């Protein structure tokens, strides 16, 4: 349900070390938060999000702020 999403902004550049699972951010970039947990529902420092051009992937929680 899109109308329930949080959205976030990137506070730093992030170049993905595993670009198969992770998405890149440019400082200032907006995104939507899809999940805060890993795929199995467990706590995680890596958050799943959808980028400004519709890519899905994980990013570091400490590189963003939640609008």
């Amino acid at each position: 349900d899109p109308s329930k999403l949080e959205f976030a902004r990137a506070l730093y550049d992030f170049v993905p070390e595993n670009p198969e699972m992770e998405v890149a951010l440019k400082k200032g970039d907006l995104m939507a938060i899809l999940s805060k947990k890993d795929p199995l529902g467990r706590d995680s420092d890596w958050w799943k999000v959808r980028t400004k051009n519709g890519n899905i992937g994980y990013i570091p929680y400490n590189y963003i702020e939640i609008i």
Partner: peptide
């Protein structure tokens, strides 16, 4: 610069 991963 930036934070630790």
């Amino acid at each position: 610069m930036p934070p630790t991963l």
